[PDB]
Amino acid sequence: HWGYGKHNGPEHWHKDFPIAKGERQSPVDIDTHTAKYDPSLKPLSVSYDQATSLRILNNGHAFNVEFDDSQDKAVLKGGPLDGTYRLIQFHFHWGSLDGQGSEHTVDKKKYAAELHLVHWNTKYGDFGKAVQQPDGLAVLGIFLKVGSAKPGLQKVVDVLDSIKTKGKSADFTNFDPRGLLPESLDYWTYPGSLTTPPLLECVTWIVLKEPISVSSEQVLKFRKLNFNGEGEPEELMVDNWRPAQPLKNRQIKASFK
Ligand SMILES: NS(=O)(=O)c1c(F)c(F)c(N[C@]23C[C@H]4C[C@H](C[C@H](C4)C2)C3)c(F)c1F
Ligand SMILES: [Zn+2]
User: Alpha-carbon distance 44 to 79, whole Å?
Assistant: First the structure.
């Protein structure tokens, strides 16, 4: 039922998922000026050398590129984190126009898109158990602006025509997610939630300060995807972002400056 239109969009979610109005919801605006520098935060450790991509799926809200998370193959650790978190999937949120699309904002600025690399805490044994814990997930957010092409994203953009409608999937092996990372790993971090229903408050958010650049043609291709299934009327998959939620009683920490 939930989605991103007039009648079922983010402002409606709280009726099915009352946690929508809770104490640690995501995304948020990152006020760069009041984020607290913390010299005790560690560098983020991104170990994606052994990543195994498997498949790409249109799930009706975004597309996910999924990874084999049955061993420690692509993990995030360090940064603000105490455990090891295995990469299970990545996906993006984007706009109908280049002026919007990101979920997090930086001093109210919206980016054309936002990449989410979703990871789960190995201590809880799998993803479904991890989302029930307050430290279950670590999601690495990376902003996308439009400019030069990101060569490392092109394999993804090139397969989207094969998964146009909700429910379609395609084999997607040997995709290297290191080709989506900007140069710097400087980050902000705060405690928050999944940004889609069920909106579970299980996420340590780690948002990179440095955006990656993607070409207008790349992001144009995201916008050719569909929310609807193959049988049905065409609703373009655009503006699948939740806007910024109240920070409430939370402090955003910065690994830098
Ligand atoms: N935007 S996000 O990074 O906060 C995010 C996830 F982290 C996610 F893990 C997911 N995936 C799930 C898969 C399934 C279990 C939960 C709830 C639903 C169904 C969405 C998480 C998701 F859709 C999502 F948008
Ligand atoms: Zn997301």
Answer: 4
